[PDB]
């Protein structure tokens, strides 16, 4: 298998809809991130959240193809990254652009304990056709990066406890059972909504390093910290990479 470029890296993806809750969610998360800086080397990647739904609404009304919507959504994830990085600026943390993440992450994590970037991948007008909704979104981009780097882990910080059998905020909330552990292949064979991109399951099938990804509730202080220590406080997704 490929070498691990940054084996000591921990990647943390912050859901766009967590950021959408504003200070009430972001301030505790920022304080938890502050306390984690001396413990881990962090690449923190932000998703897009509700503003990308609005630009999808406008863009779809204008007829625009999926390669046009993808960078419009990625912009919102970028804005969330600038917001979160500004909150950690006094700890030495800055937002870094995609080319910098791609080619200079090692020197930036040598300069400082964590950086923030956009979790969306730069598929832009080369997004795949099929759905009118860009398939390679924040979870998928974060996993692609984390696995490409051979990072020690990827933790997905959600506004719910993890993955359920139904949307726990949707019409079928009453049937929704929590899944403490699942495999990407089992999730991929289900139909129904998930809190993670469907494309995340596909890139997990071809992953080379990351064996598990935990989805944890960023609205509960301490769960991110516990997850980064391997404690089981959300849904573990087994990628189907086998351990040694």
């Amino acid at each position: 298998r490929p070498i691990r470029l940054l084996p000591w890296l921990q990647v943390v993806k912050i859901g766009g809809r967590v950021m959408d809750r504003g200070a009430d969610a972001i301030l505790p998360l920022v304080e938890e991130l502050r306390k984690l800086l001396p413990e881990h080397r962090l690449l923190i990647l932000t998703g897009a959240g509700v503003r990308a739904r609005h630009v999808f609404s406008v863009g779809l009304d204008l007829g625009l193809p999926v390669g046009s919507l993808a960078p419009l959504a990625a912009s919102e994830a970028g804005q969330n990254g600038h917001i979160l990085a500004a909150m950690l600026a006094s700890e030495g943390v800055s937002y870094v652009e995609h080319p910098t993440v791609a080619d200079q992450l090692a020197i930036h994590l040598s300069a400082t304990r964590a950086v923030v970037g956009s979790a969306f991948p730069p598929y832009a007008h080369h997004e795949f056709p099929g759905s009118r909704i860009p398939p390679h979104r924040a979870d998928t981009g974060a996993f692609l990066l984390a696995d490409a780097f051979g990072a020690a882990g990827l933790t997905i910080v959600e506004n719910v406890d993890g993955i359920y059998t139904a949307d726990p905020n949707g019409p079928d909330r009453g049937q929704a059972r929590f899944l403490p552990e699942t495999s990407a292949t089992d999730l991929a064979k289900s139909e129904g909504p998930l809190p993670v991109d469907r494309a995340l399951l596909d890139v997990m099938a071809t992953a080379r390093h990351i064996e598990r990804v935990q989805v944890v509730n960023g609205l509960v202080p301490g769960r991110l910290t516990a997850a980064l220590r391997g404690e089981h406080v959300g849904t573990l997704i087994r990628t189907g990479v086998r351990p040694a």
Partner: protein, 268 residues
């Protein structure tokens, strides 16, 4: 369906929700450059061969842009294969190789663009446009590097570290996302055969075939990057492609004129 029902789903559901996915599929379909043709000039099959292959195609591009709007993307070729071999032997991942291959396609775009510069045709870059609308309107053609912009976010193949989405895929996706009317791959064979014509004696020429028929015939990975065939089946706008031999004088001109030279591969 309605805008209000779609916007309600878009606010209240995950983007993974099948109901949202289905409402989004009913949205109107705008083609951004519906009158343009995307052409891919092969790196190994054309540009690596130097003047004897490139100069006649330059002449055709210059003559064609009088009546046709062209986006001309370049392949990469043997220097990218060399970079892939060095990087693969070091254990580097597909995402690292993706950027190495792009540099080679950029070199080829620069070489081709400099032969076209005196005809006004620019080299343009980016994971999209900027310079494309104005150049297409004024000089009817642009040159671009064909590699997709995925970089370290390249999806790896099921096996090995060679990036599976290279310049065939890059050019195809641009044709598809701009809603172009036509996608022509310019290679060094007359089209698809029942076997590799360079390594097989009596391969038979195939004028027209569907992606499903190609897969059933074991031709999934033949004259096009195999992921391109799956992209083609998913495409909204470009539902067939034409593969032609750019080493045959006038073949690109005749393909642009509607002549069925080469092989037409259809999504269905």
């Amino acid at each position: 369906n309605s805008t209000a029902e779609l916007e309600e789903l878009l606010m209240q559901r995950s983007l993974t929700d099948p109901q949202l996915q289905a409402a989004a599929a009913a949205a109107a379909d705008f083609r951004i450059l519906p009158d343009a043709t995307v052409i891919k000039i092969g790196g190994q099959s054309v540009i690596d061969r130097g003047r004897a292959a490139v100069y006649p195609l330059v002449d055709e591009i210059v003559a064609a842009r009088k009546n046709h709007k062209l986006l001309i993307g370049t392949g990469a070729g043997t220097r990218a294969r060399h970079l892939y071999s060095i990087a693969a032997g070091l254990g580097l991942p597909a995402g690292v190789l993706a950027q190495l291959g792009s540099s080679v396609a950029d070199q080829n775009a620069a070489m081709l663009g400099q032969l076209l510069a005196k005809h006004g045709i620019p080299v343009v870059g980016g994971a999209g446009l900027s310079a494309v609308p104005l150049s297409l309107a004024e000089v009817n053609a642009v040159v671009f590097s064909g590699m997709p912009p995925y970089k370290l976010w390249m999806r790896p193949a099921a096996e090995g570290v060679i990036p599976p989405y290279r310049t065939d895929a890059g050019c195809f996706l641009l044709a598809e996302q701009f809603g172009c009317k036509q996608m022509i791959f310019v290679k060094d064979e007359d089209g698809l055969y029942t076997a590799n014509p360079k390594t097989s004696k009596d391969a038979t020429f195939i004028p027209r075939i569907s992606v499903d028929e190609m897969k059933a015939k074991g031709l999934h990975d033949s004259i096009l990057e195999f992921p391109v065939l799956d992209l083609l089946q998913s495409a909204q706008h470009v539902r067939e492609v034409q593969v032609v031999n750019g080493l045959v004088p006038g073949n690109l001109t005749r393909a642009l004129a509607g002549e069925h030279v080469g092989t037409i591969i259809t999504a269905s």
